[PDB]
Write a new protein. Structure first.
Lengths: 123, 171, 55, 119
RNA sequence: AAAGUGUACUUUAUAAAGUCAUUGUAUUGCUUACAAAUAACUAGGCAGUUGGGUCGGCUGCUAUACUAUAGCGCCCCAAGCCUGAUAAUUAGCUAGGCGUAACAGCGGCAAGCCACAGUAGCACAUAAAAAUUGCUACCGUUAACGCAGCAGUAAGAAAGAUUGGACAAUAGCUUAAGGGCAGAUCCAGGUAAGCGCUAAAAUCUUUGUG
């Protein structure tokens, strides 16, 4: 059914992206090679390369799996990771960490409650 | 749009050059002017002539011959403001500041009786000429005294005369 | 967009210094990653040549 | 007055500076207020041509110096004429000759006879 | 090409860089075969129709292949081509999915391809593109509009949810000064698929007191 694409894009870029595969307030992500301009969870892919569980477990760590050999293959071809994928590769030691620009904007004081009306009802 | 390189500027100039010769227009304008509005038009004509010469390539004082005629027309008309503006922006109008021109303007204003204007012209002239003649200063002082007597009834005129007298004494 | 100021104060100096460091860091990072990609690219090309000969 | 071009002013394009100077400021030194005074950044004017229609704007050509060295091989037009903050930088010989004149201009401005903002 | 080049643009007493313009060994591809519902109370169908020759089929700038999709179009020439053909009825297809020991049967969910945006003919738009681009005629309301974008209203029907919050996360657009935009998306409200738990107290749970 979900045959992987073989021909490379002619007018767009390839990227390594995170695909949301979680539940309500229980995120889970899968890493795949997809066209830059598509739907988030589109079925058009070249390959699935890993997974990530951002929440902590009883051991206090997050768990991340990746294909070491295929990550290098696609990075050589020209796939461009997103900002978050750069962080995962940097911490995992696949490639050097990417520096971030300086920040001046006053950070948000309501980041975990601004977008959740259920908490605001109690507040 | 003007060319980026200087080596291509000659071709740009030769194509559709603007009118540059305004000597005939200025000469006719000076004779025909009999009011302050005409004097303002002459000042604009001087500005256009000074700016237009750059297309031919000249960077000299184009309006160096008709300055005397303009002064005579202003004195006959009786308006000294055009001369005050000219000295304030002498370079912009292509007029080379010189002592004979300053003396002529001061005499014209003194004849009109506007001692305050005479002080202004002398003060503006002092910013172009390092040394101001002492005889010219005495003439302006006499003009201020005559102006004060003529318009002694106006307190504002008295204050202006006093302020200009202090400026002349300080400078 | 760029930052410019007529006042030669501490704020102007800080902005120039911070920008220089960020650009220098990013330039160095780019060179390292490209070299790794080039090295990996040669390795995979060699493998394909060997596989083609075997077939 | 041409002495008012020494101090940079808001909304004062280079065209106003060039026009209100003797000989159209050919061979003069000009720079913006945003450049550091000690950076040795300035323009040297070699040729000036007025606008065909407006006659109140000028296209200038010259050299650009950074740290007292040329940045380009051949003369080019100034692409930042329309910006603000330009001011006149007389050479040392001009500064010495204009010493008393600057004092006279400053005194007149202090006494309120001359308003630099209007000019 | 995650590249090179510039008499170009921007920032610098701190400078590395980016912006704009331009550049690829032939400079963005066509063709054929097989399978897929009823249907003879549809028996004849086709004349540019089947085949052959000259000419045309543009957007240049390696060399040959004797011109290297095509009745795709004009002119000329020879009579051939199809025959469960031609004409009708019904349906978006693949597939997940539901019943069944299987074979078979039927077509709510995630995703892929195709078609369409009140109806029809056209211009751009070739190569990845027309809901929110144009021209003309027509239909319905009132020179204008067409919600099969989100919420919402009226009628119809046995039966179709709030005129909600936020860009904090994921993906995307722009931007070297670290910002801006967003009814995709993430959260909340409403409706007895399903799954889990509560609706009674107990030495104030001996995982206690001290
Ligand atoms: K249609
Ligand atoms: Mg249908
Ligand atoms: Mg239509
Ligand atoms: Mg689209
Ligand atoms: Mg409708
Ligand atoms: Mg709707
Ligand atoms: Mg983002
Ligand atoms: Mg019931």
């Amino acid at each position: 059914m979900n045959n992987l694409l073989t021909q490379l894009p002619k007018h767009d870029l390839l990227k390594i992206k995170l695909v949301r595969w979680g539940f309500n307030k229980k995120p889970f992500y899968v890493l795949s090679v997809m066209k830059r301009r598509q739907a988030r969870n589109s079925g058009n892919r070249y390959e699935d390369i890993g997974w990530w569980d951002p929440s902590p477990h009883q051991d206090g760590n997050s768990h991340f799996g990746i294909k070491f050999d295929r990550v290098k293959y696609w990075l050589s071809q020209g796939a461009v990771p997103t900002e978050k994928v750069y962080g995962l590769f940097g911490q995992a030691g696949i490639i050097p960490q990417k520096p971030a620009p300086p920040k001046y904007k006053p950070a948000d004081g309501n980041a975990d409650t601004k977008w959740r009306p259920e908490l605001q009802k109690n507040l | 749009i003007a060319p980026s390189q200087l080596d291509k500027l000659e071709k740009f100039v030769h194509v559709r050059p603007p009118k540059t010769d305004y000597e005939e227009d200025i000469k006719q304008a000076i004779s025909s002017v009999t009011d302050n509005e005409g004097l303002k038009k002459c000042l604009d004509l001087f500005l256009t002539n000074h700016a237009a010469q750059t297309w031919v390539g000249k960077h000299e004082y184009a309006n160096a011959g008709q300055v005397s005629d303009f002064i005579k027309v202003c004195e006959k008309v009786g308006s000294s403001a055009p001369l005050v503006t000219l000295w304030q922006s002498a370079y912009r109008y292509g007029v080379d500041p010189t002592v004979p021109l300053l003396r002529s303007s001061a005499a014209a204003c003194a004849a009109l009786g506007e001692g305050a204007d005479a002080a202004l012209v002398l003060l503006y002239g002092s910013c172009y000429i390092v040394n101001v003649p002492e005889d010219l200063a005495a003439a302006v002082r006499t003009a201020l005294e005559a102006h004060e007597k003529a318009q002694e009834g106006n307190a504002e005129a008295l204050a202006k005369v006093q302020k200009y007298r202090e400026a002349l004494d300080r400078l | 967009r760029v930052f410019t100021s007529n006042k030669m104060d501490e704020e102007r100096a800080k902005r120039i210094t911070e920008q220089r460091d960020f650009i220098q860091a990013r330039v160095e990072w780019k060179k390292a990653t490209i070299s790794l990609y080039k090295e990996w690219r040669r390795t995979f090309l060699q493998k394909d040549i060997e596989e083609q000969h075997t077939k | 007055s041409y002495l008012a071009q020494l101090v940079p002013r808001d909304k004062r394009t280079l065209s106003n500076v060039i026009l209100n100077l003797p000989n159209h400021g050919i061979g003069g030194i000009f720079a913006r207020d945003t450049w550091h005074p000690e950076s040795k950044r300035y323009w040297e004017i070699l040729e000036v041509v007025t606008a065909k229609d407006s006659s109140a704007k000028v296209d200038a050509y010259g050299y650009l110096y950074y740290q007292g060295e040329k940045t380009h091989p051949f003369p080019k037009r100034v692409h930042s004429v329309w910006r603000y903050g330009w001011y006149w930088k007389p050479k040392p010989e001009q500064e010495k000759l204009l010493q008393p004149l600057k004092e006279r201009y400053n005194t007149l401005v202090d006494m309120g006879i001359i308003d630099p903002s209007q000019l």
